[PDB]
Amino acid sequence: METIAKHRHARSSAQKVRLVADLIRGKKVSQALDILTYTNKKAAVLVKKVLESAIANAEHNDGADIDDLKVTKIFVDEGPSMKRIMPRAKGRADRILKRTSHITVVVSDR
Amino acid sequence: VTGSGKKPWRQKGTGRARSGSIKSPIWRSGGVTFAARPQDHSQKVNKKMYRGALKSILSELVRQDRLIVVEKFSVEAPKTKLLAQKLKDMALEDVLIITGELDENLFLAARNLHKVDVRDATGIDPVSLIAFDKVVMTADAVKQVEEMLA
Amino acid sequence: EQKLISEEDLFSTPVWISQAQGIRAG
Amino acid sequence: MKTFTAKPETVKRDWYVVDATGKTLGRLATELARRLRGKHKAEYTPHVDTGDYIIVLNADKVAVTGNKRTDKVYYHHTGHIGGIKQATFEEMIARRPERVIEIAVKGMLPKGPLGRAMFRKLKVYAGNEHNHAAQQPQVLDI
Amino acid sequence: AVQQNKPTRSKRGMRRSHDALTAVTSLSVDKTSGEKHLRHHITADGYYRGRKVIAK
Amino acid sequence: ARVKRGVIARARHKKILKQAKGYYGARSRVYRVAFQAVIKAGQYAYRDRRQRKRQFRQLWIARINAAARQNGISYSKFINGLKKASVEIDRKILADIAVFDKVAFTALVEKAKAALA
RNA sequence: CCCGGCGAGGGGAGUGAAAAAGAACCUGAAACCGUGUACGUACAAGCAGUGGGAGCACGCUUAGGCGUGUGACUGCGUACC
RNA sequence: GUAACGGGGCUAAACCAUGCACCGAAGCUGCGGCAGCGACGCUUAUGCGUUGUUGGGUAGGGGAGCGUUCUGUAAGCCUGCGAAGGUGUGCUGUGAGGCAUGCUGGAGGUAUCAGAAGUGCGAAUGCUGACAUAAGUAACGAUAAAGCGGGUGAAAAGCCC
Known part of the structure; x- marks a missing residue:
């Protein structure tokens, strides 16, 4: 039972989120x-919400058991570059490219 | 091409390729190296080569049984439906009609029939005589075509 | 919104010569 | 059809003892080179090692003709500054007699990965024996 | 002070071969409050080594 | 009569990148590089159809020599022996026989030895 | 209806012939960037190709050394204009 | 850096003299294939066919062909039982190529035979647009200067007190 969550157009380069x-x-x-909670990176904040979003997708819609x-x-894929x-x-x-990223996270009980 | 003939940027020192006109045909916008003019596509044909040609095609029409001769060919009232009935009766469908005089009823009745055209002998042309499956001529029509080619 | 279009951009062009330094020089 | 080809996971490679006493240096290193390549096996195949394992004792007693014992020079560089070091045949025998037989065959073997792989099968001693007695090598008059 | 040729994506990847992060793994549990926490740091509830330090 | 080129140009480029599969880096991705790689592939391919016929004979010769010397004769004399015995079995077949039937090969050494003495 | 800063973004349901037609909205190429399986690589030096060519993995070769992938070793080999 | 036999190596594996043996090219022979020319003159517009001989190519000369866009036969036919495009497979042409389909795609599509050309890109420091690289590298723009306690606040070095 694969379940997806995404943060599209995250304000970080794909390299840094990776x-x-x-x-x-x-x-x-x-x-x-836990690993994410004590990773000292902006990128730790962005994906963690997504993983937690994915967890909530799993309980509420179908899946469930956090265990x-x-x-x-x-x-993590490349989003649009904003041109400045x-x-x-x-x-x-x-030019400066303010790079963005598409963050995809997949979870399953099996 | 609309625009001005200022050099976009110098004969030297800038790292870019040399330029002279923003309307150079290599440039985006204002290309067209060899632009077209209105022109006359018509060709000369020798009087004799035209007549010689008409005769050859007409002679083939006979040989292929695509030429149909009749004493008379006309219609009563200017109703395409009237003509349509007649054409079925003659077992004709895709056909050119050439008549002795520019018959008007016949002319009007044929206009909306796509597979039918009407013509007086004086107004004939090479491609019409080919472009239809069968061709119908009145006795009078023959005599006029004959004199014309002779 | 999200117009996403602040920039003109209308990027600037420098010219022409700051430095002409030698030499060969003759 | 296609031609035979040796398969490294089938080929047999046998064991030999050779006495280098009185033997001319590079006129023997030729036969070692030749045999370590498997040139003598009808199932020879240039990209595969069909050669044989060869023990060589008494490398300190190999002969050279004329004035080569004293005049024949081995040069090597150290990849440094001056680098060019030098020593004679007689000095090589003295220092490490195994090297003379080793350097001979090495320069006669094909150069490259397999080339360097054939050399591995040459087992030169200075003394009159070896620890390879379990390998049951049979004597070779070469 | 410049490349003569464009370096490859492979070489780029090799250069990045030491950019990988290290996981901590070393959270510990206060004996009194039961919370995980980085070792030798206080907890979120302001506990440390079983005793109520701070107060928040 | 304006002609747009996109459809034809893609087909022509795709043929080349297809011939360049398995090459390293830009040579299998980038047309300009692939095109040079595919031609050179052709140059070498032509040449080595000639070379292939050279390499195989050298192999057969090299193997017959080993097997000939195993029955106590050199390659050069064995071939000469076969010629004067009017044996015309070529070296592709002889090198095959040298490997799979050593007893038939020995019989060809005698055949060639008798004639040569 | 959820996760979500009364956020941006999602994930569900529902509309919809079709949302991988859902507002950076017909189709939707490569460069470039990604994840996933197969094989290869930490003693081996060079227009990275081609001629041989062992091993492994698929598709049975669906009985027969057949199709594909990868492809250690080795032979020939200084890109284009 | 030996370094003025290519290297190992050689009293001969060096010269000289005779002799026989082999390797060796895309040379010549073989078998299999494609083409261009003359001479027999069957045929006898010719189409064939046996033989003889030629097929390294810069500038250039001649002789053949492919393919796209468009007009005509074009109210001629294939189309929602799925067009073009895309992305995939399968065969055959000596090549331009061509034919055969698996999956997206979701409206158009065009034998043959004619005709006309904005007619076929990789190089012009060619024009515009995306995207690499160096590189997650250099820099964050007075060397006047900060430190706590509360506050609000999802979160405070920069915001109030």
Whole structure:
């Protein structure tokens, strides 16, 4: 019984969310949250809400028992880049991409 | 192309490819290297080559049994339905009609029938004589076509 | 909303020469 | 059809003793090189090791002709600054006589991964014996 | 102070081979309150080593 | 009569990237690189159909030599023996026989030894 | 109706012929970025290809050394314009 | 860095002299294939067919072909029992290619035979748009300067007190 939750257009580069996504892949959901709770990263805050959203999806809609869930799939994809401009010296303008990410988390009792 | 002929940016020193006109045909917008004009596509045909050609096609029509001769061909009232009845009776469907004089009733009755066209002998052309399965001519129509090609 | 379009952008162009330094020089 | 090919997970590779006493250096290293490649096996196959294992005792007693005992020089560099070190045949026998037979065959073996793999089967001693008595090597007049 | 050639995605990945994080694993439980907590730190309820320190 | 190119150009590029499967990096992804890789593949392929016929004979010869010397004769004399005995079995077949039937090969060594003496 | 900062985002239900038609909305390529299975790689040096070519994994080769994937070793090999 | 036999190595595995043996190319022979030319002159517009001989190519000359967009036969036919596009398979052409379908897609689609060209990109520091790289690297813009307690507040270094 796969169950999905997502944070689309998260304000972090995919690279940065991935370091944290990797900590919980394949883990029990109870074990995953503790890891997330004491990971000192902005990216720990973003995905944890999603995992918890996924937990609530599992109880309310169907699944349930918090004991049986594992983080069976998790991947972080690239969102739209917002285009902006930064002044540099001598009248030169540089692009800045404010990068975003699509955070997908999958949970199942089996 | 609408716009101005200021050089977009210098003959030297900038890292970019040299430019001269924002309307260069390599440029986005204002391309069209060899733009078209209105032109006359018509061709000359020798008087003799035209007549020679009409005769060859007409002679084939006979050989392929696509040419149909009758004493008279006309209709009563200008009703396409009237013509339609007649054409079925003659076992004709996709057909060109060429008559002795520009007969008007016949002319009016044929206009909405897509597989039928009416023509006086004077107004004939090469492609119509080919473009229909059968071709109908009045006795009078033959004599006029004959004199014309001779 | 989310118009998402603050930037013109209308990116600026520098010109032309700050540095002409040698040398070969002759 | 296609031609035979040796399969490393089937081939047999036998064991031999060879006495290097009185034998000409590189005129023997030739036969070792040849045999370590399996060139003598009709089932020879250039990409597979069909060679044989060869013990060589009395490497300190191998012969060379003419003035090579004193004049023949082995150069090596250390990948450093000056690097170019030097020592004669006689000095090699003295220091480590095994090296002379080893360096001979090595330079006659094909160069590359398999090349370096054939060398592994050469087991040169200085003395008149070996610890490979369990391998039941049979004597070879080569 | 610049590349002559574009480095590969493979090489990029090799460079990142030490970027992986370390999990703590070392939460402990206060004997009195029963909460998990980082070792040698107080708990969220303001407990430490079984005794009520602070008060909040 | 304006012609848009997207449909035809994709088909032409797709043929090339298809020929370039299994190559490393950009050579199997990037048309400009793949196109050079596929041609060079063709260049080498042509050449090594010629080379393949060279390599196999050298192998057969090399094996017959070993098997010939096993019955106490060199390759060069064994071949000469077979020629003067008017044996025309080629080296593909002889190298096959050298491996799978050593007794038939020995019988061909005698055949070639008799003629040569 | 849920998770969710009376949030943005979701997950359900329902509308809908079809929401992987749901407001960065017909179809929807590659570059580029992702996750998943198969094989390969920490003693082996170079236009990374091609000629051989062991082992392993699939599809039975659905009885017969057949299709695919991968492909250690080795032979030939200095991209284009 | 030996380094002026390519290397191991060689009293001969070096020269000289005779002799026989083999390897060796895309050379020549074989078998299998495709093409272009003349001469027999069956046929006898020709289409064939036996033989003889040629098929390394820069600028360029000639001779053949493929494919897209469009107009005509075009109220000619295939279409919701699924078009074009996409993404996948299967065969055959000497090649441009061509034919055969699995799944998305959800309206259009076009034998043959004609005709006309905005007619076929990888290079022009070619034009526009996306997306890489270096790289999660450099920097966060006075060297005037902060530290606690409350507060609100989902969360306080920056916000009130």
